[PDB]
Coordinates of C-alpha atoms and ligand atoms in Angstrom, one line a residue:
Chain A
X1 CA 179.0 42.5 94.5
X2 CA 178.7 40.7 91.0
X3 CA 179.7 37.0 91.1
X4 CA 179.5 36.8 87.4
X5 CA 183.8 36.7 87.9
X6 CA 183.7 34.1 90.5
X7 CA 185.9 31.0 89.4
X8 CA 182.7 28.6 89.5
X9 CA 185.1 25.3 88.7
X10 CA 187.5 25.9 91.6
X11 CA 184.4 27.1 93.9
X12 CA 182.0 23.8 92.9
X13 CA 185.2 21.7 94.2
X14 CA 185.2 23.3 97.1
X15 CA 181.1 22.8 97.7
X16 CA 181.1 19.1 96.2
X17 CA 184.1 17.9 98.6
X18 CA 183.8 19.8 102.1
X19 CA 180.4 22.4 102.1
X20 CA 177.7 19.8 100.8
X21 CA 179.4 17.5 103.8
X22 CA 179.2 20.1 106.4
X23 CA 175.3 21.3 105.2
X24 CA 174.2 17.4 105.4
X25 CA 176.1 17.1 108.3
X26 CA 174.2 19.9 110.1
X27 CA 170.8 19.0 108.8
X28 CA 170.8 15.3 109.9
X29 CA 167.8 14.3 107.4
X30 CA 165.6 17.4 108.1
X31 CA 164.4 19.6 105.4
X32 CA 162.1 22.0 104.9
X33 CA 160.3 23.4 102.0
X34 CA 161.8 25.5 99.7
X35 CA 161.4 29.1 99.6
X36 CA 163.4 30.4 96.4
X37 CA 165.0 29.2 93.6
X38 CA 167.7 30.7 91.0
X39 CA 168.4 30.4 87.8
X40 CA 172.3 31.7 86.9
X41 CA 175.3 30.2 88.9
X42 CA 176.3 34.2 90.0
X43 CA 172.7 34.3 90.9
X44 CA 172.8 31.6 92.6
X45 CA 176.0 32.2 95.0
X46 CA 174.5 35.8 95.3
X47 CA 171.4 34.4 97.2
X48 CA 173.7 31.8 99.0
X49 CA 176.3 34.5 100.1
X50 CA 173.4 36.2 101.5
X51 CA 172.0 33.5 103.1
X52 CA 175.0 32.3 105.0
X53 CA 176.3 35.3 106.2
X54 CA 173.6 37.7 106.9
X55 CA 171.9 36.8 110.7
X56 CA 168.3 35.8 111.0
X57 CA 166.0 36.3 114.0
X58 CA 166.2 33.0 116.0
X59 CA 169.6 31.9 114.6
X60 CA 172.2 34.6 115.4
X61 CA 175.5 32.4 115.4
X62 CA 174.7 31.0 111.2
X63 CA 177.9 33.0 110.3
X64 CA 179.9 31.7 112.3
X65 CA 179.3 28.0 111.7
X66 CA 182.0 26.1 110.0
X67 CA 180.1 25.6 106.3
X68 CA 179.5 29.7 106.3
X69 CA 183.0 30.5 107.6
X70 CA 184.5 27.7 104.7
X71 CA 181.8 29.8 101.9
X72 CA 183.1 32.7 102.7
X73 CA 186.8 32.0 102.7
X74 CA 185.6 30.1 99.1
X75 CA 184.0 33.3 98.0
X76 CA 186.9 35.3 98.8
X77 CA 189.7 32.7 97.3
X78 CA 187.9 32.6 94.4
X79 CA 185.5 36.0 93.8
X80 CA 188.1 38.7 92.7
X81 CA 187.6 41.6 95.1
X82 CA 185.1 39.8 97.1
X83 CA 184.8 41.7 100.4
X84 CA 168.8 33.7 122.5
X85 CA 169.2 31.2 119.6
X86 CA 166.3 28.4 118.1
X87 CA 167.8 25.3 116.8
X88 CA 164.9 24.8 114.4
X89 CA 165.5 28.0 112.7
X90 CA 169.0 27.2 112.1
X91 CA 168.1 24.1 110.2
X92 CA 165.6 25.9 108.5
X93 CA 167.9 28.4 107.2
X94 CA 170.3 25.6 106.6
X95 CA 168.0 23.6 104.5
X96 CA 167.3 26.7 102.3
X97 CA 171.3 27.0 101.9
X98 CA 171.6 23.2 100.8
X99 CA 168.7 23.5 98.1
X100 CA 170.5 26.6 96.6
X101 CA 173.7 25.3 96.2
X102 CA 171.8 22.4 94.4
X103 CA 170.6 25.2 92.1
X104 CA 174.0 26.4 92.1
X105 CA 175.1 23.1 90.5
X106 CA 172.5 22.8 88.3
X107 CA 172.5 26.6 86.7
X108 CA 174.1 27.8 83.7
X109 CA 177.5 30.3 84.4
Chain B
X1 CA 152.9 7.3 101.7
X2 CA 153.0 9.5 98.6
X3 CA 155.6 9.0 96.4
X4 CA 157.3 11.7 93.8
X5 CA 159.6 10.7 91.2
X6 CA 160.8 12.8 88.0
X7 CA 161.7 10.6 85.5
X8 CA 164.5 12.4 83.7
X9 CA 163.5 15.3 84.0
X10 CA 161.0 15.2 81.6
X11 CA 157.7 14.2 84.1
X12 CA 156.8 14.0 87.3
X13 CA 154.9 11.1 88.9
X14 CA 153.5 11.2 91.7
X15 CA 151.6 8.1 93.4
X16 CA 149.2 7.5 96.2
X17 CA 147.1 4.7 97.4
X18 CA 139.7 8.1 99.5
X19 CA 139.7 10.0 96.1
X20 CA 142.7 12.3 96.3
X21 CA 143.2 15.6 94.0
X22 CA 146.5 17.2 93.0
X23 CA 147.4 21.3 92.2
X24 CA 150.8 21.8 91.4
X25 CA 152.5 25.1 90.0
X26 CA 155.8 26.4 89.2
X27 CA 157.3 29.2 90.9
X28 CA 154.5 31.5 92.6
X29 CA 151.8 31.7 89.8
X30 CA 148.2 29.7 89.5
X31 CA 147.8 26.9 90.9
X32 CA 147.1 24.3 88.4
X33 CA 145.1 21.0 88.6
X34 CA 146.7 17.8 87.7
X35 CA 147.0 17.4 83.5
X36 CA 146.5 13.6 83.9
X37 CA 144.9 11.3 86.6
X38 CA 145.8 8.0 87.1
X39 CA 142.0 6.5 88.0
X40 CA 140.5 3.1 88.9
X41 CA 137.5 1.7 87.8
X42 CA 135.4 3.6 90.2
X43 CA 136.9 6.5 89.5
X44 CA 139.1 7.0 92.4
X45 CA 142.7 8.8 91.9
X46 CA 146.1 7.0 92.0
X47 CA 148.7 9.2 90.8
X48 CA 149.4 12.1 88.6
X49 CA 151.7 12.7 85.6
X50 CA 153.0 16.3 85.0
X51 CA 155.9 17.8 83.1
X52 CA 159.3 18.5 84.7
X53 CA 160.6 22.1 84.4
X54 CA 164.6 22.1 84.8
X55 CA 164.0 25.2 86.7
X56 CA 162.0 26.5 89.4
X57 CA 160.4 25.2 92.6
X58 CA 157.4 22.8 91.9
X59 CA 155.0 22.9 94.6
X60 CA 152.8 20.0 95.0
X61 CA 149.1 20.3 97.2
X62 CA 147.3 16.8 97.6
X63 CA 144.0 17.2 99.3
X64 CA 141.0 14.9 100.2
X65 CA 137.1 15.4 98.8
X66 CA 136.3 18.4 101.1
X67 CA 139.8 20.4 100.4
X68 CA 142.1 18.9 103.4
X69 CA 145.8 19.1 102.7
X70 CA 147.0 15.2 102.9
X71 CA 150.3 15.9 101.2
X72 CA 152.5 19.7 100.3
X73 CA 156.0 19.5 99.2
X74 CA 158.1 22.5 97.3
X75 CA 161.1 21.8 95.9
X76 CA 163.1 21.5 92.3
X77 CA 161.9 18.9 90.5
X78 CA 165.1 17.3 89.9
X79 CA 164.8 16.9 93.9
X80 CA 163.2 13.6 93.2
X81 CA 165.2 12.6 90.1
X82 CA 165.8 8.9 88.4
X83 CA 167.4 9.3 85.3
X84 CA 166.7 7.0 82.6
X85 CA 169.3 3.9 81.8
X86 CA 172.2 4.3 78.8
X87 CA 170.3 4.0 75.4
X88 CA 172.7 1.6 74.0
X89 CA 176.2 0.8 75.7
X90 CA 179.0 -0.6 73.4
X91 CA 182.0 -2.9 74.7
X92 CA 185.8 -2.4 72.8
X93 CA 188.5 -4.7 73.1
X94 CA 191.7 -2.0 73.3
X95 CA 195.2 -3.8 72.2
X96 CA 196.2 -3.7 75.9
X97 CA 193.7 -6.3 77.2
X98 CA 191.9 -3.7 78.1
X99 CA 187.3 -2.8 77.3
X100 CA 186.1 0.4 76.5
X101 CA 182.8 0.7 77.9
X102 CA 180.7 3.7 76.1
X103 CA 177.5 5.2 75.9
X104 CA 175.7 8.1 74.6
X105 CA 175.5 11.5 77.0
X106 CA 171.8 12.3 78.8
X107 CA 170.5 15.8 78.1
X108 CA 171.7 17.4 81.3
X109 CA 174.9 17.0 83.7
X110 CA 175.1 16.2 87.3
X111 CA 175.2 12.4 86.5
X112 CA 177.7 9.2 87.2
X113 CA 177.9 6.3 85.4
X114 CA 178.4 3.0 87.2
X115 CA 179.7 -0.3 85.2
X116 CA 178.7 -3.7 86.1
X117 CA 181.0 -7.0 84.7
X118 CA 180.9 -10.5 85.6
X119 CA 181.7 -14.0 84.2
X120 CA 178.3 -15.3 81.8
X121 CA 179.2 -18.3 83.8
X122 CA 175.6 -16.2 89.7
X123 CA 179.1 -14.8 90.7
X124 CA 179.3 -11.0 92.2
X125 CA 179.1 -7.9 90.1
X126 CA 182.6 -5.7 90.0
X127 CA 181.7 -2.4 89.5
X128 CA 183.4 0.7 88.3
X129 CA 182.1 4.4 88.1
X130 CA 183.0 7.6 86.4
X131 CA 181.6 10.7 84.2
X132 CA 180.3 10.6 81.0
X133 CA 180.6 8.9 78.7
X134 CA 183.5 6.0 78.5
X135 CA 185.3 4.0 81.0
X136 CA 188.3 1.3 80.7
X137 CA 187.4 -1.9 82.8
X138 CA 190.8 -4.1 82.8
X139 CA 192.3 -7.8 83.3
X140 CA 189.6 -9.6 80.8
X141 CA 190.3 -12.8 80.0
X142 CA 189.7 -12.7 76.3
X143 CA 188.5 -16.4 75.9
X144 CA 185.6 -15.8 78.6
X145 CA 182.3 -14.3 78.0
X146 CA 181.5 -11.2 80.3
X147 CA 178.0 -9.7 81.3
X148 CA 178.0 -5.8 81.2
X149 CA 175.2 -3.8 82.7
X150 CA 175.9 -0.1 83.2
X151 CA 173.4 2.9 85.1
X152 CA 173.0 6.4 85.8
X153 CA 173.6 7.7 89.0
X154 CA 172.7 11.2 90.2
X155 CA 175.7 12.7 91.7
X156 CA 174.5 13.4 95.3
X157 CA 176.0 17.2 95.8
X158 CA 174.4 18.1 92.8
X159 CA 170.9 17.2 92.9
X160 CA 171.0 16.3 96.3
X161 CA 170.0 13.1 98.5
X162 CA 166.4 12.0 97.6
X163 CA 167.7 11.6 93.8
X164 CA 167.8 8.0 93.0
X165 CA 169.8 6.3 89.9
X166 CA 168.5 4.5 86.3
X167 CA 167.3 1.1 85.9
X168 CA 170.7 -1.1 84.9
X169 CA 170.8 -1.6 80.7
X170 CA 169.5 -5.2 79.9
X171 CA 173.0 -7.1 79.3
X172 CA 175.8 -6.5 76.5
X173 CA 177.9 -10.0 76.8
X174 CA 181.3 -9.3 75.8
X175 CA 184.1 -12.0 73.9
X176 CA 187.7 -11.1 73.8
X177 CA 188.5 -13.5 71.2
X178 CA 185.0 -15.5 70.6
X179 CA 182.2 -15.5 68.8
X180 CA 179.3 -14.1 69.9
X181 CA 177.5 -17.6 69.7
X182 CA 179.9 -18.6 72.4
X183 CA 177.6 -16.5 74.8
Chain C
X1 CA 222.6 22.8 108.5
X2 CA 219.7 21.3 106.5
X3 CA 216.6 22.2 107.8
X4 CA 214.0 20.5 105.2
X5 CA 210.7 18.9 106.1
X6 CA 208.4 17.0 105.8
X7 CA 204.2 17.7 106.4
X8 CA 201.4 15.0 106.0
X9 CA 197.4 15.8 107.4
X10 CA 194.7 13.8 108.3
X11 CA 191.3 13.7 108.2
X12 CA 188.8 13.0 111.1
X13 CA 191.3 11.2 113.3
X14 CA 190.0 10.5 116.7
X15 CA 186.7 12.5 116.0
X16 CA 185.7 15.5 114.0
X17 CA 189.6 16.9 114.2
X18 CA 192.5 16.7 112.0
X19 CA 195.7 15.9 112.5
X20 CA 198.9 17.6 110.7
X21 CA 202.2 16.0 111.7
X22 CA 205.6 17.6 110.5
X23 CA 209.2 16.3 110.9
X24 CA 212.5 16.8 109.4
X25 CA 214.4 15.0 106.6
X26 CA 217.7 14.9 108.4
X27 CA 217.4 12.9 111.8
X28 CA 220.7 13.6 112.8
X29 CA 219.6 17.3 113.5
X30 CA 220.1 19.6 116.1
X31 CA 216.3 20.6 116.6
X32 CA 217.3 22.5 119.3
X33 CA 214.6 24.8 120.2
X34 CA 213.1 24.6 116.7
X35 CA 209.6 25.2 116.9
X36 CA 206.6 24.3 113.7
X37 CA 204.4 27.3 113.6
X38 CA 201.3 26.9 110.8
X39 CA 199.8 30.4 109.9
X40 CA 197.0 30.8 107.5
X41 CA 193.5 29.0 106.4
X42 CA 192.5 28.1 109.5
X43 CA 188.8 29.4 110.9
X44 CA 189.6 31.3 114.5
X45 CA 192.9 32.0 114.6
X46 CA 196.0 33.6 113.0
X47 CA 198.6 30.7 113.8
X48 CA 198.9 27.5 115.7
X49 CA 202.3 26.2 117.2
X50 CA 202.9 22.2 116.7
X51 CA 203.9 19.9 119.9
X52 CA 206.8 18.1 119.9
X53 CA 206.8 14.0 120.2
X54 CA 210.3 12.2 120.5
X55 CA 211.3 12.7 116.6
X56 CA 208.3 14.4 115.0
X57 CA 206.2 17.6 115.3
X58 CA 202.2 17.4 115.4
X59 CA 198.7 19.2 116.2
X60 CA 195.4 17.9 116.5
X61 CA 192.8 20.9 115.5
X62 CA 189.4 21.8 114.7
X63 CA 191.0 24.9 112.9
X64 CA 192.2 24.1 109.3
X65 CA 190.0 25.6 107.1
X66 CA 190.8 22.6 104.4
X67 CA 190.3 25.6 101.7
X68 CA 193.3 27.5 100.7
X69 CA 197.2 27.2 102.0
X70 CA 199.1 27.9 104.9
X71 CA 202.5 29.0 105.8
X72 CA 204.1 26.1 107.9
X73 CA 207.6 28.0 109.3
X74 CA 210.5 26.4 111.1
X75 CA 211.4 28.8 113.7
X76 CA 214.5 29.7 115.9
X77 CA 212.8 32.2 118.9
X78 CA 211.6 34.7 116.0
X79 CA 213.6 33.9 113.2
X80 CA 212.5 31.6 110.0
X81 CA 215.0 29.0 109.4
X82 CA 212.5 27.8 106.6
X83 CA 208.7 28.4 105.6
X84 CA 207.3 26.4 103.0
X85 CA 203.1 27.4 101.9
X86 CA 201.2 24.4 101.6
X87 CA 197.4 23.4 101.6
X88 CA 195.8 20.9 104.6
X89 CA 194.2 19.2 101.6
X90 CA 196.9 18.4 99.4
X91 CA 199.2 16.3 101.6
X92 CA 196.3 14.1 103.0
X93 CA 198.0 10.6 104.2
X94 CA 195.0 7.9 104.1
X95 CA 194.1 5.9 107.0
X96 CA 195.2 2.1 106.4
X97 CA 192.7 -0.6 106.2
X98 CA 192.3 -3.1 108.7
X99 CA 190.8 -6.6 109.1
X100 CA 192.7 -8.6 105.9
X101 CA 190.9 -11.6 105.5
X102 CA 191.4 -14.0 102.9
X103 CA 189.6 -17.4 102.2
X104 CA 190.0 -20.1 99.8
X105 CA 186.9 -20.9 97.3
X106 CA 187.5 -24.4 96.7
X107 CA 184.4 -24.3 93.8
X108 CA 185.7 -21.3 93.0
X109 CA 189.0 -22.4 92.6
X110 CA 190.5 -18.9 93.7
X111 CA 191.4 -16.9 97.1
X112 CA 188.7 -14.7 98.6
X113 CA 190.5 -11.3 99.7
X114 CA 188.5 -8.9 102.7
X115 CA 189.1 -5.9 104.0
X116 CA 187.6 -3.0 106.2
X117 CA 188.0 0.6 104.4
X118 CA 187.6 3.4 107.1
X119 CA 187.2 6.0 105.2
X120 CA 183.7 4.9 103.8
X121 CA 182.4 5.8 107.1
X122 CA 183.7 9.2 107.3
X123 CA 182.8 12.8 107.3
X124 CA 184.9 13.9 103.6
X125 CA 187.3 11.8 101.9
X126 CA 184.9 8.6 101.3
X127 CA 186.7 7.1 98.3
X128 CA 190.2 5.7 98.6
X129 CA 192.1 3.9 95.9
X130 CA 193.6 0.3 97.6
X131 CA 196.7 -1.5 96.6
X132 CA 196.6 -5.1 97.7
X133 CA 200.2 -6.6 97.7
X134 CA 201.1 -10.2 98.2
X135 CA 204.2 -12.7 97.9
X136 CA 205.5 -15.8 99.3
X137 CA 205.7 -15.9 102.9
X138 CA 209.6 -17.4 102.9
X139 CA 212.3 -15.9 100.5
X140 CA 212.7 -13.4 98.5
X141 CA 210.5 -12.1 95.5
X142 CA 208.8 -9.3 93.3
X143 CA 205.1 -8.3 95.7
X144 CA 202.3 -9.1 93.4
X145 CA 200.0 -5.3 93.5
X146 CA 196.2 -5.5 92.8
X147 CA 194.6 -1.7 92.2
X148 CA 190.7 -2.0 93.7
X149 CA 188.2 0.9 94.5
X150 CA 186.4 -1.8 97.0
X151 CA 187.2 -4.2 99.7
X152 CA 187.3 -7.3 98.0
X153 CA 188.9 -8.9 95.3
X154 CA 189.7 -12.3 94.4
X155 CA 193.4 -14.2 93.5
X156 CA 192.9 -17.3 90.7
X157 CA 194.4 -20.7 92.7
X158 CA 196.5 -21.0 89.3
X159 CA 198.8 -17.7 90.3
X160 CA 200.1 -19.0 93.1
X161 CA 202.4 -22.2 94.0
X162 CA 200.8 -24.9 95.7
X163 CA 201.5 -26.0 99.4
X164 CA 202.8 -22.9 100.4
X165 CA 202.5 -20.0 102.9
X166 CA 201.7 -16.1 101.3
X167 CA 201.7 -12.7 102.8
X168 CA 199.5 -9.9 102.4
X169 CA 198.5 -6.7 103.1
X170 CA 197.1 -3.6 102.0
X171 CA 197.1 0.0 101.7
X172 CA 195.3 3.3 100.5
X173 CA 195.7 6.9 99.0
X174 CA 193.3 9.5 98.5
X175 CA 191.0 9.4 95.0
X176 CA 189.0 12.4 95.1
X177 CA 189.5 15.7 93.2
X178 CA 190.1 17.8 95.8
X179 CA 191.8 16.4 98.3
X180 CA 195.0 15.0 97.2
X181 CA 197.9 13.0 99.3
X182 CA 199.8 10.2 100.0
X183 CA 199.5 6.2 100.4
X184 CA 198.4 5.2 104.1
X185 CA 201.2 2.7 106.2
X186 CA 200.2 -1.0 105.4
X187 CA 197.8 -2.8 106.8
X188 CA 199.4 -5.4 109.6
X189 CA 200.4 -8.4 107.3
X190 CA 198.2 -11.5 107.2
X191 CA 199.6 -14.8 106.1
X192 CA 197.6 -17.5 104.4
X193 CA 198.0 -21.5 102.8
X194 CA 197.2 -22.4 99.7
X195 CA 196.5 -26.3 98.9
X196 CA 197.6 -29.0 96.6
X197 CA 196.8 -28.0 93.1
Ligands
LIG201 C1 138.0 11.7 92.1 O1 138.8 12.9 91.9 C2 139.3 13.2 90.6 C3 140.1 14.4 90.7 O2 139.5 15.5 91.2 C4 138.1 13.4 89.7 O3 138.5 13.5 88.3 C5 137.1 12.2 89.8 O4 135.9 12.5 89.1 C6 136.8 11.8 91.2 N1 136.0 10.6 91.3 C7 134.9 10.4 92.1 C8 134.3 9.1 92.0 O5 134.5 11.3 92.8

């Protein structure tokens, strides 16, 4: 999909005011280093669209937590014509969503 | 304890403090060894100075005199950003009773502004907050002289939590209806 | 045969849930087997029915998305009397603040005025703008309203009369530009004494 369309205003609301709460929320002070970066704000919701939704090995149930099901209702509202477990993994993965969305904000549209 | 800081994003600093050495990179090229030592009389490292890229992950190795890693960390550079203070704030009586409080942008977004006021006359600060780059700061008595002090704060959701904000400005004193030799 | 409504929700009430509470304008209402049904932007399920409490309609969830509106629906068995489409994060009603204190500076020569904020402690929804309202204690007159962003402010001695009992209290409304909503209830009121001027 290209989130080049995406209303980015309505979708950074969304991430400042209930996402960034519900990643912090989750991480309780952990972090890990970061593996990639991006540069463009559809860019960057690409990588975190991917990163939410698509399992991992060791943490099966990521889509399913509330922050992924709340991006992916935000991609959907606002992208026209959007379509056993390890809790260290999880807050791995989680981390790497956090740092994105950080690139996110900080990327050109 | 090492400590990284990226002074609006224009350097990072990173401080320590054996004779520690510093790689860095951008991205996943080279390795590169640290442009600028801070070092002691005996020659012993205390920090390094390198530029800030507004882009990209900068990965940071730290190792001991036999190639030990003492310190690694990968992340943005703006991860560990303190923006500068307000190059010059300016105070505006309104007709209403009312003080604009105003200051030039910074060169990159993601930042609040918080506004400090008190009596000249050791009472508590009263702060107010917004974006850049004015605020209104009400019920002045116009006969009294005011302190202002204002900072940057990086907005938490945007560069995240190990950001920290500016150094306050040094003081603009502020009277209503006075002379500034009155404060 | 006026079935309007009202709807107010709110954030992170006895936990990590919400709470959206419903009722009608019109109290003199037959509400007769009326039933509150909320469909849409919620995370697990299609609809949720609301539970009924002497004069007013509520549910306490973990299912409102907070992102996008719902459908809530007056029902009679399967017919829609009324549906109105609403978002969870527009008609947030803020929790009141609690523990008024106020204190007289004597050096100061001015009132002291405390207060707890709850929502600086919570999940979303951290910044509240207060409205502090005081008056005479006895008789009749215009409440005095200070607007603050934080839990203290101060009253000059000169404002008020001298040897006399005030009231207070205080309330709060959602500042945030997301969320969006309506003032808390007050605060219990506190009373204090001012001295001789
Ligand atoms: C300490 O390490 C720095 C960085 O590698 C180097 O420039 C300096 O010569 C060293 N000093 C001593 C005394 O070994």
């Amino acid at each position: 999909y290209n989130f080049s369309n995406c209303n980015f205003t309505s979708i950074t609301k969304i991430y400042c005011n209930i996402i960034f709460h519900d990643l912090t929320g989750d991480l309780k002070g952990a972090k890990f280093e970061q593996i990639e970066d991006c540069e463009s704000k559809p860019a960057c919701l690409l990588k975190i669209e991917y990163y939410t939704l698509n399992p991992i090995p060791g943490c099966p149930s990521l889509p399913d937590k509330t922050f992924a099901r709340r991006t992916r209702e935000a991609l959907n509202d606002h992208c026209p014509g959007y379509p056993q477990e390890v809790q260290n993994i999880c807050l791995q993965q989680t981390s790497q969503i956090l740092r994105l969305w950080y690139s996110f904000m900080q990327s050109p549209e | 304890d090492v400590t990284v800081v990226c002074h609006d994003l224009e350097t990072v600093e990173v401080t320590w403090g054996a004779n520690l050495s510093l790689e860095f990179r951008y991205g996943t090229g080279a390795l590169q060894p640290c442009p600028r030592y801070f070092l002691s009389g005996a020659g012993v490292t205390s920090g390094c100075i390198l530029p800030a890229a507004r882009a990209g992950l900068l990965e940071l190795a730290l190792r001991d005199g036999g190639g030990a890693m003492v310190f690694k960390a990968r992340q943005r550079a703006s991860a560990w950003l303190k923006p500068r203070p307000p190059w010059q704030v300016t105070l505006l009586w309104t007709p209403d009773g009312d003080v604009t409080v105003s200051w030039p942008a910074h060169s990159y977004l993601g930042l609040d502004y918080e506004v400090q006021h008190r009596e000249s006359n050791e009472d508590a600060w009263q702060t107010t907050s917004g974006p850049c780059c004015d605020l209104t700061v009400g019920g002045l008595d116009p006969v009294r002289c005011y302190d202002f002090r204002v900072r940057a704060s990086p907005r938490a959701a945007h560069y995240g939590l190990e950001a920290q904000p500016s150094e306050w400005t040094a003081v603009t004193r502020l009277s209503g209806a006075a002379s500034a030799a009155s404060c | 045969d006026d079935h309007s409504f009202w709807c107010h929700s709110q954030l992170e009430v006895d936990g990590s849930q919400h709470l959206l509470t419903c009722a009608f304008n019109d109290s003199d209402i037959n509400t007769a087997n009326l039933e509150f049904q909320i469909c849409g932007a919620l995370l697990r399920v299609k609809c949720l029915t609301l539970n009924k409490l002497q004069d007013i309609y509520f549910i306490k969830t973990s299912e409102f998305l907070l992102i996008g509106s719902s459908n809530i629906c007056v029902k009679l068995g399967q017919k829609n009397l009324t549906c109105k489409n609403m978002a969870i994060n527009t008609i947030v009603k803020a929790e009141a603040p609690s523990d008024l204190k106020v204190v007289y500076r004597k050096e100061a020569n001015d009132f002291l005025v405390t207060f707890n904020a709850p929502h600086l402690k919570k999940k979303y929804l951290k910044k509240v703008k207060h409205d502090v309202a005081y008056r005479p204690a006895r008789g009749e007159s215009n409440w005095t309203h200070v607007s603050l962003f934080h839990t203290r402010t101060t009253i000059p001695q000169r404002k008020l009369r001298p040897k006399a009992m005030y009231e207070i209290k205080v309330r709060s409304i959602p500042h945030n530009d997301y969320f969006k909503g309506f003032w808390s209830e007050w605060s219990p009121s506190s009373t204090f004494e001012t001295p001789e001027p």
